[PDB]
């Protein structure tokens, strides 16, 4: 009786939201950006090849200096690279080799990683002893760790396969806030530039916008037909892009609370693993299962170019803070640094 | 290149040397993935031979490292294991169709297309007793079992009841039928009949892994 009545009210509320989104869907992003000129052909060359990983690379993250990056592989090795010289700055042996994510602290003093061990391990890069040591192990997730991102040296946000995201206090080792509401494994998260909000994509084909301080879900974004694997905030924080296994990328708007554009091609039938934006946000770069990285025009939904330099799945990618280069990691155990030439 | 850059580059080469030394050490062991249902009894298979549970056992001076995670997302991590040890409980007729669908997902997974499955049809003693009692009928769950006959080329074990032999080959055929429906030789299923006291499981994995590695080499020698 009461349960049946309540679940009918949820359907009415869903229709109310759907009508509300349709009310503000006066125009389409495609119509708005029809007049602007295309970005042309985007040609990027492999400037650097980072060799030394002996297994599948699962994650990479640039440091804020746009020169150092950390990559994670399932050989149980965290490696910090000097991208300018390809020198290896550090090689961190992982207690659990089944790592799936890695994060570089914005200060550059810490890196984080974690995988099927359900632990987010914090590593101190600046010690008087001259070696990298574990400073914290963040326990509390009941599923694998899929993504992690620092807010500062003391706060980090992690997404897990136990359908929840958590905000952690690194000094005390306790999760101050738990973000619940996803019905599937959360595969990725992206922080807003002001670090007051973050979006997460799960395997329930939905993206949720979370308030860090308040700790609740502000908006829910649906429209994908399969698991979401990647998510990335727009550089101004008012939009984000997702990548799913249905071979499509979608651009959702926070304030309009709906999808604005879909990035798919008929030839593309493979899943998407990673997404990122260029510094101005005009380009959306996505890594694919078909061994390629497609550069999309975010505004016009045009495939601007292709990065074809890997012999296995493109598992991760990232764009530097200064926008100078993009790194691609792959299951073929190599990392490549790309940028164009005049 | 400055004086500090040379010292930095020399540090990088010392890192690269230890990266290769650890990689070669990791290749000296064969990695196995243990899968199965709750009633499979895969733990008992491991214990007799001996978030992630790991066990190391050695057969003829060869080290095996088997991982029992205790799933379409994290199964991609084990994309480069030597073999998958999929265990089922053949006695429980009710959950056999669940195991067949579970096996079908693993076999047809996009990230396990080159991973051979070492099937372990566990708890054969219970299956033999269940058929002997006759209280439960396999035909109730599988209608096609009533029209199935033991192959003439079959080689039953000595002292084995023909009723049990007909049942065992039917259950094995269902898994083999899934295996032979796709793959085209990229991966091969290696079914086995094991019980709760069998102590030859480790050697069966070792012998099957020799064929899995040999099949890997033959593709290298031929697909050039």
């Amino acid at each position: 009786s009461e349960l049946d009545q309540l679940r009918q009210e949820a359907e009415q509320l869903k229709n109310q939201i759907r009508d509300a989104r349709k009310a503000c869907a006066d125009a389409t992003l495609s119509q708005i950006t029809n007049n602007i000129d295309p970005v042309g052909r985007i040609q990027m060359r492999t400037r650097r090849t980072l060799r030394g990983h002996l297994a599948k690379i699962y994650a990479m993250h640039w440091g804020t200096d746009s020169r150092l990056l950390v990559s994670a592989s399932q050989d149980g090795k965290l490696i910090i690279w000097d991208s300018y010289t390809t020198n290896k700055v550090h090689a961190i042996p992982l207690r659990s080799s089944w790592v799936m994510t890695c994060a570089y602290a914005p200060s550059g003093n810490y890196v984080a990683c974690g995988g099927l061990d359900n632990i987010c391990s914090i590593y101190n890069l600046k010690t008087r002893e001259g070696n990298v040591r574990v400073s914290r192990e963040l326990a509390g997730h009941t599923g694998y760790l899929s993504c992690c991102r620092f807010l500062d040296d003391n706060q980090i946000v992690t997404s897990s396969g136990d359908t929840t995201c958590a905000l952690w206090d690194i000094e005390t080792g306790q999760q101050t806030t738990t973000f619940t509401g996803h019905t599937g494994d959360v595969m990725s998260l992206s922080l807003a530039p002001d670090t007051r909000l973050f979006v997460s994509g799960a395997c329930d084909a939905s993206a949720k916008l979370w308030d860090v301080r308040e700790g609740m879900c502000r908006q829910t974004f649906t429209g994908h037909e399969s698991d979401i694997n990647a998510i990335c905030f727009f550089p101004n924080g008012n939009a984000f892009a997702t990548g799913s296994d249905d071979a499509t990328c979608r651009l959702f708007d926070l304030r309009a609370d709906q999808e604005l554009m879909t990035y798919s091609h008929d030839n593309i039938i493979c899943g998407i693993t990673s997404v990122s934006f260029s510094k101005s946000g005009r380009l959306l770069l996505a890594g694919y299962d078909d061994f390629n990285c497609n550069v999309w025009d975010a505004l016009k939904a045009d495939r601007a170019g292709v990065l074809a330099g890997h012999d296995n799945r493109v598992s991760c990618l990232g764009v530097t803070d200064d926008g100078m280069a993009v790194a691609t990691g792959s299951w073929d155990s190599f990392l490549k640094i790309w940028n164009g030439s005049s | 290149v400055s004086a500090e850059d040379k010292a930095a580059a020399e540090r990088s080469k010392m890192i690269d040397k230890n990266l290769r030394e650890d990689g070669e050490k990791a290749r000296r062991t064969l990695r196995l993935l243990l899968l199965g249902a709750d009633n499979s009894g895969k733990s008992t298979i491991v214990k007799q031979m001996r978030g992630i549970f790991e066990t190391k056992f050695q057969v003829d001076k060869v080290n095996f490292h088997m991982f029992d995670v205790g799933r379409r997302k994290w199964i991609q991590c084990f994309n480069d294991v030597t073999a998958i040890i999929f265990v089922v409980d053949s006695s429980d007729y009710n959950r056999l169709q669940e195991a067949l669908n579970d096996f079908k997902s693993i076999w047809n997974n996009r990230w396990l297309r080159t991973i051979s499955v070492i099937l372990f049809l566990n708890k054969q003693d219970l299956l033999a007793e269940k058929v002997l009692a006759g209280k439960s009928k396999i035909e109730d769950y599988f209608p096609e079992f009533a029209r199935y006959t033991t192959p003439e080329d079959a080689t039953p074990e000595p002292g084995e009841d023909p009723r049990v032999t007909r049942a065992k080959y039917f259950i094995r055929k269902e898994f083999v039928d899934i295996s032979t429906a796709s793959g085209d030789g990229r991966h091969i299923c290696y079914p086995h009949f094991t019980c709760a006291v069998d102590t030859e499981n480790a050697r069966r994995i070792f012998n099957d892994c020799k064929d899995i590695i040999l099949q890997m080499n033959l593709r290298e020698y031929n697909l050039v």
Partner: single-chain antibody
């Protein structure tokens, strides 16, 4: 972090002596090691360098062929075998650790030193002494015969402070970066061949001799040193 030197003492001219440097509290095998000596009432002089992994070894010209530097990583001991000792070798010998990667701070820790008694880019610090008062800003100037700015953007200039009775301590590495544990009042500014160390709001602890060292190439050379007195 500790670096203890031993084996020094009065030796006859033309003799041989073995200096040891035992390291504790840090990963010794990860750091390159230098020997730096200081003649009595004189400035610092670099002696030798052995890299991490013992693959690269450098000597100063005044000691090349007579000194041998070696390390024992399992025992965390640094060695300096000296032969044909001259009266010019009478100095306090310091054991210095230095690790080299992007953003590292070489020459960050010095040992207490051991005393030995026997019976090229030019770094200039023209101002030998500077009278100072507490709370007042002080500037120290350094000059180099060659430009220390490399094509990679680094300027390999280092600043050290040797308080009376104490071993030198790193203040500024690569001409602008502030060493760990050093107050923010110290600031390093430079360009090309001319460098300035500015000390705002001088305190009693800042009193001492300041040395500027170049790390552009071997042999590493020190300035004469500028002494601060009240």
């Amino acid at each position: 972090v500790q670096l203890v030197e031993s084996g020094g003492g009065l030796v006859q001219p033309g003799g041989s002596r073995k200096l040891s440097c035992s390291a504790s509290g840090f990963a010794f095998s990860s750091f390159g090691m230098h020997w730096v000596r200081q003649a009595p009432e004189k400035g610092l002089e670099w002696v030798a360098y052995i890299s991490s992994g013992s693959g690269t070894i450098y000597y100063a010209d005044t000691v090349k062929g007579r000194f041998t530097i070696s390390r024992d990583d399992p025992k965390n001991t640094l060695f300096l075998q000296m032969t044909s000792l001259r009266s010019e070798d009478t100095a306090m010998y310091y054991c210095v650790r230095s690790i080299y990667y992007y953003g590292s701070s070489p020459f960050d820790f010095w040992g207490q030193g051991t005393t030995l008694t026997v019976s090229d880019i030019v770094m200039t610090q023209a101002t030998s002494s500077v009278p100072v008062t507490p709370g007042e800003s002080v500037s120290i100037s350094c000059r180099s015969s060659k430009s220390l700015l490399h094509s990679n953007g680094n300027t390999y200039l280092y600043w050290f402070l040797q308080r009376p009775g104490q071993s030198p301590q790193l203040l500024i590495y690569r001409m602008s970066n502030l060493a760990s544990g050093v107050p923010d009042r110290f600031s390093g500014s430079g360009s090309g061949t001319a460098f300035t160390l500015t000390i705002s709001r001088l305190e009693a602890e800042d009193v001492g001799v300041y040395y500027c060292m170049q790390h552009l190439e071997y042999p590493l050379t020190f300035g004469a040193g500028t002494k601060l007195e009240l």
